[PDB]
Design a protein around this ligand. Structure first.
Ligand code: NAP
Ligand code: FMN
Lengths: 58, 679, 49, 49
């Protein structure tokens, strides 16, 4: 699906503009080896509930 | 009559009042220019036909020779060729819903089925919609040569807009109609109508007044206040026949409007109405193609008094709300889950400008799709892997199966439209075009007529193309699908395939016919359906599937009984009796019956100069109503359900040295003329 | 058709093309619709060139 | 040449008598082919296989 859409609309490569983390989260992700992106609004973004969460070590 | 005895500068252009001199006109008695007395002049009266039938002689009934109770011409209901015919035979007049036909040939066929089924000689009208320049592109030229062939189309009502004056000239003079109907909604539209009538003081014009309390399309203006300013300046145009509708369902419901005693609520003279048309009252008739569940729903929805019809813009008022059209014109519709969803959508998404529309749809996508599959009639198309989904995540086979399920009624083994059949076929043409490679071979689809039972054809077809059951729809075959779904000249798609700026373009267009066939509804739940109806009229729609003839007869009889009790003292013998009803004015309207000389054994010579034509015809007619007076005065001669011009209406043109002989109480007319000196 | 697409021979035009609605492959130089077969027979000489 | 010309003549004679409205229906509606660019991840064999 993606390839067909792209090769038709010349958007195979979509340049990223903002990182998955936010500037206020760009460090706290770096220190947690378990904080990983969750998805919302059809976007894969880092949150705060994922950083140093108490449930990612069950 | 008002006489401005102070000043002598006569006269006002419309002769509203007299001046100083009108005291002095000393011609033997002719001075007494009386004032229009609406309560006396055009009061509803009774008249017995020679067959013993009793009619309500009005200015309108007198025009149509039948009861003063006509049927509007709604596009969904009135387009069915059965309801309109089965009520013409009931004796009441109907205008055919021209809106429901997109092709001249289809309308011509429907007309021909009408003519074959109505009584020989009856005539019908055609309701057109002025804001469809395509429909007036081919309808008007059709009416021209059709009337030229002489089909019994006796009227053309131009609803949803009043034409300009010079185009009304064409509407009147060229196409040989008997009466022209107009549906004004604004006081300025009424001014335009009067500007029209004064241009052709002899061609009758039926003014159909509909307030805002009506059904279907909708008008903002109140029902009374417009006419309460124009009743006077209308009645000063003798050609305009005024008919009020928009929410009438019972005999006593409308009786004050016929009598005119309705103005008492406003401390005004009684202002009688000529005729009364009907809208939503008839949709529950047996002879209507309204879905049984839809009729049941209509009977369910309670009415709303006129004092509180304006609250329809907010809440379900007895189960009826208005809502903006594709173009923002209000449209009174019954209140179903689908209709509530319609209103909510118009309220939040469609009111927005173009820009944020995409985003609003994006943040509301799943919620929209929820009710579009739950409450609306054009459901969300994509449905794959047991989940609602987008289009581009469906295999070809399941795409085709969904198209079948949403465009072919398995119960009646028919297509919603053959043009949809052709769309489906044109899509399979692309499927096979795709999944084949350098073949130059025969297509499994040679004739789209194979598709008249797709259920098995496609099923066996996907064997020659197995992987189309598993490869998803490609995009170039998806955008093509959409481009099909909105090709011109095709019936609009019965579902919604996407969420884009054209959302309403798929959501609202052609949202009317489904009330006729709820079997095309995904679950045949009327709550998906868009049914048009009038708020105030609903408080009378209590019986379902009653014959269309009975309704109008049930109310005409109530009117007759009331008018007998009131203006004839409960004695029917006092009712005047005429042989036939129509054509000549029996009440002395401003028509030349005084120069009509009636007699038993009469001869009167004539020369080339005296007289002109019309009054000569009248002289020949005689005052009273006899077959000869009819035949000499009738405008129309029926030739086996045709309406061709009257032969005598020109062959008896005044001529030099001629003479006519009407002797032995009109038992024979005998016209003479001079030949070679002999007569 | 892929080598045509990356060499800039065809461009998937969509929408209205000279009035008619269109969703398909189009030449890149004159911008006229082209079936999926004429791709080879029409460009294979140039592509390999 | 005679088997060509007599064939042409009897074809056009039929196209006149039968009319040119059904003779197009004798020519079968052949299928144009499209391209079917998939992506086609490498085919997974079955486990036991
Ligand atoms: N005054 C009132 O109270 C009142 C009440 C109800 C409705 N109305 C009016 O009456 C109209 C009723 O029509 P609608 O709203 O149901 O239609 P619609 O949703 O406005 O869509 C009609 C369009 O679809 C196309 N179409 C429809 N059927 C077709 C067929 N069988 N074949 C090919 N093309 C077809 C037509 O294209 P073409 O251009 O090719 O014809 C036409 O432009 C409305 O537009 C409304 O304004 C007024
Ligand atoms: C079921 C139904 C279908 C209608 N279809 C049309 C139409 O195709 N064109 C039009 O100008 N008015 C249409 N109308 C409006 C009526 O002609 C009239 O203006 C209104 O019904 C009068 O209001 P009332 O029903 O309360 O007397 C329709 C009304 C109803 C109830």
């Amino acid at each position: 699906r993606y390839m067909h859409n792209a090769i038709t609309r010349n958007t195979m490569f979509v340049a990223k503009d903002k990182a998955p983390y936010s500037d206020e989260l760009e460090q706290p992700v770096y220190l947690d080896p378990l904080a990983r992106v969750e998805e919302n609004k059809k976007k894969l973004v880092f949150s705060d509930k994922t950083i140093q969460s108490s449930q990612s070590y069950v | 009559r008002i006489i401005l005895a102070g000043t002598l500068d006569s006269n006002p252009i419309d002769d509203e009042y007299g001046f100083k001199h009108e005291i002095f006109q000393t011609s033997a008695d002719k001075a007494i220019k009386w004032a229009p007395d609406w309560l006396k002049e055009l009061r509803p009266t009774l008249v017995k036909n020679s067959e013993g039938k009793i009619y309500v002689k009005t200015k309108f009934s007198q025009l149509l020779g039948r009861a003063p109770l006509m049927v509007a011409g709604m596009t969904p209901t009135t387009v069915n060729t059965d309801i309109v015919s089965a009520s013409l035979n009931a004796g009441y007049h109907i205008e055919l819903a021209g809106g429901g036909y997109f092709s001249p040939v289809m309308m011509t066929r429907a007309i021909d089925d009408i003519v074959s089924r109505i009584k020989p000689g009856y005539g019908l009208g055609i309701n057109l919609i002025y804001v469809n320049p395509f429909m007036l592109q081919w309808g008007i030229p059709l009416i021209k040569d059709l009337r030229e062939k002489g089909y019994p189309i006796q009227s053309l009502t131009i609803g949803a807009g009043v034409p300009s004056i010079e185009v009304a000239t064409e509407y009147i003079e060229d196409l040989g109609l008997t009466h022209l109907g107009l549906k004004p909604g604004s006081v300025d539209a009424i001014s335009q109508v009067i500007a029209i009538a004064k241009a052709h003081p002899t061609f009758p014009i039926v003014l159909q007044w509909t307030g805002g309390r009506g059904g279907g399309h909708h008008s903002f203006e109140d029902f009374h206040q417009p006419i309460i300013q124009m009743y006077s300046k209308i009645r000063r145009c003798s050609n305009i026949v005024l008919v009020a509708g928009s929410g009438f369902g019972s005999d006593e419901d409308t009786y004050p409007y016929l009598s005119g005693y309705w103005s008492e609520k406003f401390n005004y003279p009684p202002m009688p109405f000529d005729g009364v048309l009907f809208g939503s009252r008839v949709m529950t008739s047996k002879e209507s193609h309204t879905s049984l569940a839809a009729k049941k729903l209509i009977v369910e929805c309670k009415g709303v008094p006129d004092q509180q019809w304006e609250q329809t813009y907010k809440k379900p008022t007895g189960g009826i709300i208005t809502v903006r059209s594709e173009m923002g014109e209000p449209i009174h519709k019954i209140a179903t889950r689908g209709v509530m969803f319609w209103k909510e959508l118009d309220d939040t998404i469609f009111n927005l400008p173009k820009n944020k529309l995409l985003d609003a749809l994006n943040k509301k996508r799943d919620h929209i799709i929820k009710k579009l599959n739950n409450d609306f009639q054009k459901p969300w198309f994509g449905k794959n892997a047991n989940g609602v989904c987008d289009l581009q995540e469906m295999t070809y086979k399941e795409v085709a199966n969904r198209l079948v399920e949403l465009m072919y009624v398995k119960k009646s083994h028919r297509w919603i439209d053959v043009s949809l059949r052709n769309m489906y076929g044109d899509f399979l043409r692309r499927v096979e075009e795709r999944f084949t490679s350098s073949a130059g071979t025969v297509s499994l689809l040679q004739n789209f007529n194979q598709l008249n039972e797709p259920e098995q054809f496609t099923a066996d077809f996907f064997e020659k193309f197995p992987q189309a059951g598993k490869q998803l729809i490609s995009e170039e075959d998806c955008d093509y699908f959409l481009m099909l779904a909105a090709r011109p000249g095709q019936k609009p798609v019965p579902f919604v395939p996407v969420l884009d700026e054209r959302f309403e373009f798929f959501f609202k267009k052609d949202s009317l016919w489904q009330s006729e066939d709820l079997e095309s509804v995904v679950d045949e739940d009327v709550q998906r359906t868009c049914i048009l109806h009038g708020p105030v009229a609903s408080q009378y729609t209590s019986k379902v599937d009653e014959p269309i003839g009975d309704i109008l007869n049930s109310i005409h009889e109530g009117h007759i009984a009331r008018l007998i009790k009131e203006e004839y003292a409960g004695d029917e013998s006092k009712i005047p009796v005429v042989e036939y009803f129509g054509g000549k004015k029996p009440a002395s309207v401003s028509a030349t019956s005084v120069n009509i000389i009636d007699g038993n054994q009469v001869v009167y010579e004539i020369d080339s100069e005296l007289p002109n034509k019309q009054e000569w015809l009248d002289l020949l007619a005689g005052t009273e109503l006899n077959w000869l007076q009819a035949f000499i005065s009738t405008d129309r001669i029926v030739q086996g359900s045709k309406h061709v011009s009257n032969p005598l209406h020109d062959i008896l043109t005044p001529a030099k040295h001629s003479k006519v002989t009407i002797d032995k109480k009109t038992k024979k007319l005998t016209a003479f003329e001079n030949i070679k000196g002999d007569l | 058709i892929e080598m045509a697409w990356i060499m800039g021979f065809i461009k998937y035009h969509n929408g209205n093309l000279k009035g008619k609605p269109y969703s398909g492959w189009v030449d890149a130089k004159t911008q006229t619709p082209i079936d999926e077969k004429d791709i080879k027979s029409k460009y294979e000489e140039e592509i390999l060139e | 040449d005679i088997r060509r010309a007599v064939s042409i003549e009897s074809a056009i004679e039929q196209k006149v008598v039968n009319g040119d409205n059904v003779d197009a229906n004798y020519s079968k509606v052949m299928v144009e082919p499209r391209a079917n660019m998939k992506f086609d991840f490498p085919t997974l064999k079955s486990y036991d296989e």
